[PDB]
């Protein structure tokens, strides 16, 4: 049973690494620019954002950023002009674009918590 | 093409169902979850069995390719994956290699006895399925309507199997490892020989895209699952459809189909969070493997036929025996 | 007529020990019901189970026989147990409200720092505040064998212990819950407010007057009648005779919160109504 | 197209006979079909 104990120790360490990785994945907000695959990550005001630039591989996402040049029922749409929809005429001059994405994602979180309690 | 249309009715004589009217039913098969493999933090899209019928490998969306010892429920190895987008996994006949792949258009081979020993590039679409032909050759099927055999030594497409008009999403290698059959979006499945890139045969019976396929253990037949909420058992030698496995209570697509060791029982996974067992000779539901919280994505039968393992989107593998 | 009271009170103690046990079983036998929120609605169910199995059976013997037929020590443990279980139940209702509060107002806390450990800490504070009102004031101030034997199970009508217990078990918790559910209403009303749109406005600011009315009405219509009496009579000994009938209806109204809690917090939301169906 | 039609095809009767032959001959060694003892079950 010495070999069995060695294998059990191997299992224990892997489980600990996976637990750390899960702790780090729960606090990530996944968004998709839907206007090879590209990935970007950045933190803004203590909130990490994980955007992918490209139908069932993407299912557990928070919002779908979708730019317009002047599982969808359960995902909000941040409509940029270069379930509730949020629209903001783009303004590359300032960093308001990022502030909008933050204010929208923060409201999707608050409204999903006002439905679990059963108050909406 | 005129000859093809005529030959089918000419050789279609007595329905296989008519021939099987004499065979006695299998009764009722009740399978019970023996073990529960847990540790994936996200949806599991694929799982492959080792030829030893003991070790297996699973691929999930948390960039994780985990090797598990099914008997002792122990994580042997946890291999992190560059892409978090992963649709396929495999496990070499030898036991010294696994292979994954996904949205990234690269098939990533890992040497077991863990670091990427080779990356295979060239496909212009998501890898849907891959199967180790031997210790040195691999067959892959991609979302740009092209299948390919790869030499690992150099790292190039040796041949390229083209002709499908839709995204090839399922791939089955024959027991003799001489031929392979591919199922794609065009509701058609094509037989190909690895020797020459010449489509040996084409079968058109389904109504929707084909998501699963698996050879019969004899190697002369195959079964195909589609989004048409039906499965179909074709025959290589007969070059046509013989039986259809569909039930009205089922309207969702099939994600995975597998045969028993003798090929009598046809396990099939569905989107109703259930797995229906069918009589491959009688088109009769021999049982149900209910118990998965999310959709059953991939299903496997051990080489010795001892047990069947089901992976699912609920981040849990279930061994049933 | 001792038979009539026995089967009425008996059914109440059965429905409670069954309803509160079904709730905790569902949390354990389902993985869809395993979040920080339901760990607090399972702990409350467990506390009500303890109330329904330990305190309630021996309160019913005291009512049907009209006398304590057990030892003086038994009376002391059951007065202590009764206080402990009730106080923890009231503070569990106040912890669930404190968590709900920080979902609607602090989204960063909800995402970057909300752990199952939070549930553990909210439950630990509820039980620490229970063992402060029950077990310190008993051990230490105990008269030396100078009491009557029957009808002896009565909480002290001392003036210091009256304020200490009543304020630390109901009046301090009630005020906090009224402030917290008032702020949750304003926040919800704002977000909802900010012809078809006007229709689904009225029908979202009238399922947020119901839920909050149900919760507050259940908690106040049960406990307030009892804590008002428990606060006024100790100070007004002369000329405030309390009838038996009304004085017993109020005690059992207070106890009925243990039965009603699983219905208000558990038997109503969809996630439980679905899990019970899969199991049964 | 022409070479796919050129292949020779056996009548569904002999394919059925071969499919039955393979199924009955290997029936006894299928643990799933014939319920296997707990002494063999390795899980
Ligand atoms: C004059 C004009 C207007 C006024 C007139 C009329 C309108 C109303 C008046 C007063 C109403 C009183 C009570 C209403 C109850 C009622 O309508 O309940 C609804 C229907 O449920 C059932 O039918 C199922 C209920 C099952 C209960 C349990 C049954 C078993 C009990 C014994 C248990 C132990 C033995 C098994 C369900 O709830 P709901 O429609 O009331 O709305 C909400 C509820 O209030 C929220 O609390 C709940 O959140 P939670 O706090 O997590 O639970 C929400 O999810 C949601 O359910
Ligand atoms: C009366 C004693 C002795 C026996 C126990 C009776 C219990 C089980 C009964 C009495 C009154 C009942 C309640 C009366 C009305 C409602 C409102 C309805 O929308 C949901 C069920 C609910 C909330 C009932 C739940 C069960 C209940 C609490
Ligand atoms: C969990 C539910 C079913 C409650 C279980 C305990 C019930 C059945 C018990 C608790 C106290 C008990 C009572 C205690 C004392 C007496 C007096 C004597 O003349 C026997 C009947 C009677 C009146 C008992 C009836 C049954 C009773 C009410
Ligand atoms: C403890 C037992 C004996 C009595 C329980 C009484 C409960 C069920 C009663 C008392 C006060 C009542 C509330 C009083 C007012 C309102 C506002 C109205 O717009 C919706 C119903 C609602 C929210 C009632 C729901 C039922 C309620 C909470
Ligand atoms: C819906 C829920 C909250 C209803 C709860 C009803 C409760 C409060 C009722 C139902 C039966 C009632 C009891 C019935 C009979 C008696 C005997 C009497 O000499 C004193 C009061 C007493 C002991 C009652 C106390 C209150 C009581 C327990
Ligand atoms: O019927 C009995 C019998 C017991 C002995 C066994 C069990 C009960 C003795 C007994 O008192 N009564 C009558 C009930 C009085 C009210 N209950 C409710 C809880 N109360 C409280 N809780 C927290 C803070 C302050 N007070 C006071 C006690």
CB B269 within 8 A of CB B310: yes
Strand B88-91: give its sheet, edge to edge: B88-91, B97-101, B107-111, B115-120
**DSSP state letter for B32:** -
- Which residues, at least 6 apart from B279, have a Cβ–Cβ distance to it below 8 Å? B25, B26, B264, B265, B266, B286
Q: Is residue C12 in contact with ligand 2, taking CB distance under 6 Å?
A: yes
Please give the Cα distance from D17 to D23 (Å, whole number): 10
- Which residues, at least 6 apart from D31, have a Cβ–Cβ distance to it below 8 Å? B261, B304, B305, B306, B307, B321, D40
C-alpha distances in angstroms, B174 versus B108, B192, B219, B279, C273?
A: 23, 10, 6, 22, 49
Closest listed residue to residue B278, CA positions, set B290, B291, B265, B288: B265
Other C-beta atoms closer than 10 Å to the C-beta of B101 total 31
Number of H helices, E strands in chain D: 2, 0
Q: Is A18 on the interface with B (CB under 8 A)?
A: yes
Please give the Cα distance from A29 to A60 (Å, whole number): 10
CB C20 within 8 A of CB C263: no
C-alpha distances in angstroms, C131 versus A41, C78, C84, C156?
A: 48, 14, 6, 18
- Domain interval for residue B231: 1-320
Q: Please name the helix (run of DSSP H) or strand (run of DSSP E) that holds residue B189, with its range, or none.
A: strand B189-193
User: Can you name the residues that pair with B48 across neighbouring β-strands?
Assistant: B57
User: Can you name the residues that pair with B193 across neighbouring β-strands?
Assistant: B179
Cβ-in-10-Å burial (0-12, 13-18, 19+) of C189 comes to middle
Closest listed residue to residue B106, CA positions, set B76, B62, B137, B150: B150
Say if residue A54 carries a ligand binding annotation. yes
CB D1 within 8 A of CB B1: yes
Name the closest ligand to CA C16: 1
C-alpha distances in angstroms, C205 versus C63, C187, C215, C217, C269?
A: 45, 11, 16, 18, 18
- Which residues, at least 6 apart from C140, have a Cβ–Cβ distance to it below 8 Å? none
Architecture in CATH of D1-43:
Irregular (4.10)
C9 C-alpha to center of ligand 5: Å?
A: 7
Q: Give the β-pairing of A48-53 and A38-43.
A: antiparallel
Please give the Cα distance from B317 to B124 (Å, whole number): 31
Phi, psi of B207, deg, nearest 5: -110, -20
Question: Three-state SS string across A35-89, please?
Answer: CCCEEEEEECCCCEEEEEECCCCCCCCCEEEEEECCCCCCCEEEEEECCCEEEEE
CB B300 within 8 A of CB B49: yes
Closest listed residue to residue C108, CA positions, set A29, B194, B230: A29
Question: Three-state SS string across chain C, please?
Answer: CHHHHHHHHHHHHHHHHHHHHHHHHHHHCCCCCCCHHHHHHHHHHHHHHHHHHHHHHHHHHHHHCCCCCCCHHHHHHHHHHHHHHHHHHHHHHHHHHHHHHHHHCCHHHHHHCCCHHHHHHHHHHHHHHHHHHCHHHHCCCCCCCCCCCCCCCCCCCCHHHHHHHHHHHHHHHHHHHHHHHHHHHHHHHHHHHCCHHHHHHHCCCCCCCHHHHHHHHHHHHHHHHHHHHHHHHHHCCCCCCCCHHHHHHHHHHHHCHHHHHHHHHCCCCHHHHHHHHHHC
Other C-beta atoms closer than 10 Å to the C-beta of C30 total 18
Q: Is D34 on the interface with B (CB under 8 A)?
A: no
CATH for C94: 1.20.1070.10
Residues of A in Cβ contact (< 8 Å) with B78: 14, 17-18
Please give the Cα distance from C34 to C41 (Å, whole number): 11
* Tokens 């948390």 belong to residue: B62
Region of B91 (left: φ > 0; alpha: ψ -120 to 50; beta: rest) is beta
Q: Give how far A51 is from chain B: nearest CA, Å.
A: 13
- State both tokens at C236: 């007004």
Q: How many structural domains comprise chain B?
A: 1
CATH code of A27-116, in short, is 3.40.50.300
Q: Would C143 be classed as within a structural domain?
A: no
Residue of A19, A63, A117 for testing the chain C interface, max C β-carbons within 10 Å: A117
CB D25 within 8 A of CB D19: no
C222 C-alpha to center of ligand 4: Å?
A: 11
User: Can you name the residues that pair with B155 across neighbouring β-strands?
Assistant: none
Name the closest ligand to CA C58: 6
Q: Is A23 on the interface with B (CB under 8 A)?
A: no
Q: How many structural domains comprise chain C?
A: 1
Q: How far apart are the first and last CA of chain C?
A: 38
Structural domain spans, chain D? 1-43
C-alpha distances in angstroms, B255 versus B95, B228, B300?
A: 26, 11, 12
Closest listed residue to residue B244, CA positions, set B266, B263, B214: B266
Residues of A in Cβ contact (< 8 Å) with B66: 14
- Which residues, at least 6 apart from B221, have a Cβ–Cβ distance to it below 8 Å? B215, B233, B234, B235, B236, B242, D15, D19
Other C-beta atoms closer than 10 Å to the C-beta of C129 total 20
- State both tokens at A45: 């005001």
All partners of chain A with 3 or more CB pairs under 8 angstroms:
B, C
Closest listed residue to residue B103, CA positions, set A30, A55, A65: A55
Angle C100-C106-C108 from CA coordinates, rounded to 5°: 120
Please give the Cα distance from B231 to B229 (Å, whole number): 7
Please give the Cα distance from D43 to D30 (Å, whole number): 17
CB A118 within 8 A of CB A82: no
DSSP, collapsed to helix, strand or coil, labels residue D13 as helix
Please give the Cα distance from C154 to C76 (Å, whole number): 9
- State both tokens at A110: 């608050």
Please give the Cα distance from B317 to B38 (Å, whole number): 7
Taking the C-alpha atoms of C261, C262, C267 and C268 in order, what is their torsion angle to the nearest 10 degrees? Answer: 20
- State both tokens at B49: 């069995």
Please give the Cα distance from C33 to C186 (Å, whole number): 29
Please give the Cα distance from B287 to B25 (Å, whole number): 13
Pocket residue to mutate for ligand 5, from C19, C251, C252, most atoms within 8 A of Cβ: C252
CB B126 within 8 A of CB B143: yes
* Tokens 């330990």 belong to residue: C54
User: Can you name the residues that pair with A24 across neighbouring β-strands?
Assistant: none
C-alpha distances in angstroms, D34 versus B321, D10, D21, D31?
A: 12, 31, 17, 5
Say if residue A113 carries a ligand binding annotation. no
Tally the residues of chain A.
120
- State both tokens at C262: 């699983």
**Within 6 Å (CB) of ligand 3, which residues are found?**
C 2, 6, 9-10, 13-14, 17, 57, 60-61, 64-65
Give the CA count within 13 Å in the CB-facing half-sphere of C15. 15
Q: Which residues in C56-89 are b (16+ Cβ under 10 Å) and which e? A: bebbbebeeeeebeeeeeebeebbbbbbbbbbbb
* C-alpha A5: how far from chain center: 40
Q: How far apart are the first and last CA of chain A?
A: 57
Nearest CA in chain B to D29: B262
Other C-beta atoms closer than 10 Å to the C-beta of B42 total 17
Please give the Cα distance from A17 to A37 (Å, whole number): 27
Give the CA count within 13 Å in the CB-facing half-sphere of B59. 27
Please state the atom number of ligand 4 nearest to the C-alpha of residue C206. Answer: 19
CB B207 within 8 A of CB B216: no
Question: Three-state SS string across B121-156, please?
Answer: CCCCCCEEEEEECCCCEEEEEECCCEEEEEECCCCE
Please give the Cα distance from C54 to C69 (Å, whole number): 17
Dihedral (CA of C158, C164, C166, C169) sign = negative
C-alpha distances in angstroms, B314 versus A46, B118, B257, B318, C125?
A: 30, 31, 19, 11, 35
Q: Give how far A111 is from chain C: nearest CA, Å.
A: 8
- State both tokens at B16: 């296989």
- Which residues, at least 6 apart from B18, have a Cβ–Cβ distance to it below 8 Å? none
List own/partner pairs for C95-99 with CB under 8 A and 24 or more apart.
C95/C40, C95/C122, C95/C123, C95/C125, C95/C126, C96/C37, C96/C40, C96/C41, C96/C44, C96/C265, C97/C176, C97/C177, C97/C180, C97/C181, C98/C122, C98/C176, C98/C180, C99/C36, C99/C37, C99/C40
Nearest CA in chain B to A54: B103
DSSP, collapsed to helix, strand or coil, labels residue D33 as coil
Q: Is A60 on the interface with C (CB under 8 A)?
A: no
Angle A90-A94-A100 from CA coordinates, rounded to 5°: 55
CATH for B295: 2.130.10.10
Taking the C-alpha atoms of A58, A62, A68 and A72 in order, what is their torsion angle to the nearest 10 degrees? Answer: 60
* Tokens 């030893």 belong to residue: B52
DSSP, collapsed to helix, strand or coil, labels residue B249 as coil
Give the CA count within 13 Å in the CB-facing half-sphere of C19. 24
Q: Please name the helix (run of DSSP H) or strand (run of DSSP E) that holds residue A110, with its range, or none.
A: helix A96-116
Q: Give how far A72 is from chain C: nearest CA, Å.
A: 21
Q: Please name the helix (run of DSSP H) or strand (run of DSSP E) that holds residue B18, with its range, or none.
A: helix B16-19
What is the crossing angle of helices C210-232 and C244-255, to 10°? 140
Phi, psi of C247, deg, nearest 5: -65, -20
Q: Give the β-pairing of A76-81 and A63-68.
A: parallel
- Domain interval for residue C127: 2-138+149-279
DSSP, collapsed to helix, strand or coil, labels residue B258 as strand
Closest listed residue to residue B193, CA positions, set B167, B170, B161: B161
Residues 3-32 of B with CB under 8 A from D: 3-4, 7, 11-16, 19-20, 23, 26, 29, 31
Query: Do residue D12 and residue B16 have CB atoms under 8 angstroms apart?
Result: yes
How many beta-carbon pairs below 8 A join chains A and C?
Answer: 51
* C-alpha B270: how far from chain center: 14
C-alpha distances in angstroms, B187 versus B243, B253, C203?
A: 16, 13, 47
Q: How far apart are the first and last CA of chain D?
A: 50
Say if residue A118 carries a ligand binding annotation. no
Cβ-in-10-Å burial (0-12, 13-18, 19+) of C143 comes to exposed
Phi, psi of B137, deg, nearest 5: -130, 145
Closest listed residue to residue B189, CA positions, set B154, B156, B236: B236
Residues of B in Cβ contact (< 8 Å) with A10: 74-76
Closest listed residue to residue B111, CA positions, set B99, B127, B102, B121: B99
Q: Please name the helix (run of DSSP H) or strand (run of DSSP E) that holds residue B181, with its range, or none.
A: strand B179-183
- State both tokens at C145: 């064998």
**DSSP state letter for D18:** H
How many beta-carbon pairs below 8 A join chains B and D?
Answer: 122
Please give the Cα distance from C258 to C92 (Å, whole number): 12
Residues of D in Cβ contact (< 8 Å) with B199: 4
Please give the Cα distance from B62 to B56 (Å, whole number): 18
Please give the Cα distance from B74 to A4 (Å, whole number): 10
Residue nearest to atom 19 of ligand 4 (CA): C210
Cβ-in-10-Å burial (0-12, 13-18, 19+) of A115 comes to exposed
Other C-beta atoms closer than 10 Å to the C-beta of B11 total 16
* C-alpha B281: how far from chain center: 20
Q: How far apart are the first and last CA of chain B?
A: 46
Resolution of the experimental model in angstroms, please? Answer: 3.0
Dihedral (CA of C133, C138, C140, C143) sign = positive
Residues 92-111 of C with CB under 8 A from A: 100, 103-104, 107-108, 110-111
Q: Which residues in B272-302 are b (16+ Cβ under 10 Å) and which e? A: bbbbbbbbbbbbebbbebebbeebbbbbbbb
Q: Give how far A13 is from chain B: nearest CA, Å.
A: 9
């Amino acid at each position: 049973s010495s070999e069995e104990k060695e294998a059990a120790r191997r299992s224990r360490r892997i489980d600990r690494h996976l637990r750390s990785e899960s702790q780090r994945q729960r606090r990530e907000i996944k968004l998709l620019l839907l206007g090879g695959i590209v990935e970007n990550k950045f933190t803004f005001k203590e909130l990490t954002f994980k955007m992918v630039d490209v139908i069932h591989c993407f299912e557990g996402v928070t919002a779908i950023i979708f730019c317009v040049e002047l599982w969808f029922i359960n995902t909000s749409l941040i409509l940029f002009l270069n379930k509730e929809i949020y629209s903001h005429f783009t303004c590359a001059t300032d960093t308001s674009n990022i502030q909008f994405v933050f204010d929208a994602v923060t409201d999707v979180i608050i409204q999903n918590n006002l439905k679990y309690i059963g108050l909406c | 093409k005129n000859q093809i249309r005529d030959a089918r009715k000419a050789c279609a004589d007595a329905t296989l169902s008519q021939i099987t009217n004499n065979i006695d039913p299998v009764g009722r098969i009740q399978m019970r979850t023996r073990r529960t493999l847990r540790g994936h933090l996200a949806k599991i899209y694929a799982m492959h069995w080792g030829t030893d019928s003991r070790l297996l490998v699973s691929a999930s969306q948390d960039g994780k390719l985990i090797i598990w010892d099914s008997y002792t429920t122990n994580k042997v190895h946890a291999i992190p994956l560059r892409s978090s987008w992963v649709m396929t996994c495999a496990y070499a006949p030898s036991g010294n290699y696994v292979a994954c792949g996904g949205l990234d258009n690269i098939c990533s081979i890992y040497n077991l006895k863990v670091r990427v020993s080779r990356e295979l590039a060239g496909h212009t679409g998501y890898l849907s399925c891959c199967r180790f032909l031997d210790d040195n050759q691999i067959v892959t099927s991609s979302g740009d309507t092209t299948c390919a055999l790869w030499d690992i030594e150099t790292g190039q497409q040796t041949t390229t199997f083209t002709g499908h008009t839709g995204d090839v999403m399922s791939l089955s290698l024959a027991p003799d490892t001489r031929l392979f059959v591919s199922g794609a979006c065009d509701a058609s499945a094509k037989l190909w020989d690895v020797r020459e890139g010449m489509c040996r045969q084409t079968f058109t019976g389904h109504e929707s895209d084909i998501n699963a396929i698996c050879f019969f253990p004899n190697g002369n037949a195959f079964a195909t699952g589609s989004d048409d909420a039906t499965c179909r058992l074709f025959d290589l030698r007969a070059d046509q459809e013989l039986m259809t496995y569909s039930h009205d209570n089922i309207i969702c697509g099939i994600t995975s189909v597998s045969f028993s060791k003798s090929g009598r029982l046809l396990l099939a996974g569905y989107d109703d969070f259930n797995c229906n067992v069918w009589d491959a000779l009688k088109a009769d539901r021999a049982g149900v493997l209910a118990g998965h919280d999310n959709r059953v994505s991939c299903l496997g039968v051990t080489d010795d036929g001892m047990a069947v393992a089901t992976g699912s989107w609920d981040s849990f593998l279930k061994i049933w025996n | 007529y001792q038979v009539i009271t026995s089967l009425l009170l008996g059914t109440l103690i059965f429905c409670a020990v069954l309803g509160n046990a079904c709730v905790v079983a569902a949390i354990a036998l389902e993985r869809s019901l395993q979040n920080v929120a339901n760990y607090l609605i399972g702990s409350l169910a467990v506390t009500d189970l303890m109330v329904s199995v330990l305190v309630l059976p021996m309160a019913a013997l005291y009512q049907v026989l009209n006398k304590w037929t057990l030892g003086q020590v038994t009376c002391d443990l059951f007065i202590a147990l009764d206080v402990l279980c009730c106080t923890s139940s009231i503070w569990h209702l106040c912890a669930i409200a404190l968590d709900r509060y920080w979902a609607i107002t602090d989204p960063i806390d909800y995402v970057n720092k909300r752990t199952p450990r939070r549930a553990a800490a909210l439950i630990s504070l509820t039980w620490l505040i229970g063992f402060l009102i029950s077990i310190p004031p008993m051990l230490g101030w105990r008269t030396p064998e100078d009491r009557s034997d029957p009808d002896a199970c009565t909480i002290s009508k001392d003036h210091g212990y009256t304020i200490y217990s009543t304020f630390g078990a109901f009046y301090i918790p009630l005020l906090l819950m009224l402030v917290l559910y008032g702020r949750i209403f304003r926040a919800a009303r704002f977000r909802i407010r900010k012809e078809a749109k006007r229709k689904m406005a009225l029908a979202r600011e009238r399922k947020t007057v119901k839920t909050l009315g149900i919760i507050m009405g259940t908690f106040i219509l049960c406990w307030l009648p009892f804590f008002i009496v428990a606060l006024v009579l100790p100070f007004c000994e002369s000329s405030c005779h309390m009838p038996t009938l009304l004085g017993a209806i109020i005690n059992w109204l207070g106890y009925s919160n243990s039965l009603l809690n699983p219905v208000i917090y558990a038997y109503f939301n969809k996630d439980f109504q679905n899990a019970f169906k899969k199991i049964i | 197209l022409k070479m796919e039609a050129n292949i020779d095809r056996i009548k569904v009767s002999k394919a059925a006979a071969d499919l039955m032959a393979y199924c009955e001959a290997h029936a006894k060694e299928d643990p799933l079909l014939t319920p296997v003892p707990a002494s063999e079950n390795p899980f």
